[PDB]
């Protein structure tokens, strides 16, 4: 069962968004219904092993159902989702590198997960990154608790209102 992470709200002078692939969430055991009482962190450099010995990111043993549960991150293959871009620099060819998804239905795709035996029901936080409409990049944009990010490129305002993160089955 595959999941998708999205960013919602109304966007003003934004061109792209991207998380850094490391964030906490909350899971719950299928065949049980009982939820995990903590928030686990799912990075992309972690290592694990399932029942057949495959290489996954995280591994938890469901207490009630009494089996193993695995999660792992996919990468959003570069031919249809990420659409390589560039950005400005000094006079010789630096041209800073970035990948940015597409705004299909008034939201951006940022990550993709594959799950066995567990099930994600929420996500707590992340590390946000903003790309101006022309060329300037804001890193680690401190979003409000009131869900409005805002930064200024020395004159103008790029901002996002009604900010939230979701998890939809794919």
């Amino acid at each position: 069962m595959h999941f998708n992470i999205f960013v919602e709200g109304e966007f003003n002078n934004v061109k792209g968004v991207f998380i850094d692939q490391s964030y906490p969430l909350r899971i719950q055991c299928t065949n049980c219904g009982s939820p995990h009482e903590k928030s686990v962190v799912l990075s992309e450099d972690s290592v694990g092993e399932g029942d057949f010995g495959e290489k996954v990111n995280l591994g938890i043993t469901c207490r009630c159902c009494r089996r193993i549960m695995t999660l792992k991150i996919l990468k959003l293959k570069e031919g249809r989702e990420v659409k390589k871009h560039l950005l400005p620099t000094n006079f010789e060819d630096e041209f800073k590198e970035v990948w940015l998804s597409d705004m299909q239905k008034s939201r951006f795709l940022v990550s993709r997960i594959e799950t066995n035996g567990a099930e994600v029901t929420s996500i707590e936080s992340c590390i946000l990154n903003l790309v101006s409409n022309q060329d300037v990049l804001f890193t680690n944009v401190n979003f409000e608790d009131r869900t409005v990010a805002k930064c200024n490129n020395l004159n103008m305002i790029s901002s996002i209102i009604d900010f939230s993160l979701t998890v939809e089955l794919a």
Partner: protein, 126 residues
């Protein structure tokens, strides 16, 4: 009162809970555990058979049905013919919602001279 029949198919995957007429030609409710979970591995477990026999309970219990005659089955034929795990936990969940019980029977299909089935001369080597 008013009586209906409950056809309950239960195998290693995906129990069924299907309620019909006395003739059997008119359906009153049909909910399969398997449209209660999101993992394909657990379509046929006893927790998903309890989530399925509770929706069927509240619905037909307002549509006027009071009594139930049962008809159980496995998969029969050239397939394994014995009731699965989520069989007994859908019956016990309807008996508690308030319904009464009539006759009980087992109606699995019996091959009296079958056809050949999968695997070969050596079987499925896993």
């Amino acid at each position: 009162e008013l009586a209906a029949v409950a056809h309950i198919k239960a195998t290693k995957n995906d129990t069924f809970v299907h309620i019909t007429d006395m003739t059997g030609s008119e359906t009153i409710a049909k909910i399969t555990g398997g449209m209660r979970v999101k993992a394909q591995r657990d379509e046929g477990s006893p927790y998903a058979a309890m989530l399925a026999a509770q929706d069927v309970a509240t619905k037909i219990l307002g549509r006027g049905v009071k009594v139930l005659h049962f008809k159980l089955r496995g998969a029969g034929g050239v397939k394994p013919m014995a009731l699965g795990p989520g069989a007994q936990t859908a019956i016990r969940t309807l008996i508690r919602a308030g319904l009464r019980v009539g006759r009980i029977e087992d109606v699995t299909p019996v091959a009296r001279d079958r056809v050949r089935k999968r695997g070969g001369h050596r079987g499925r080597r896993v």
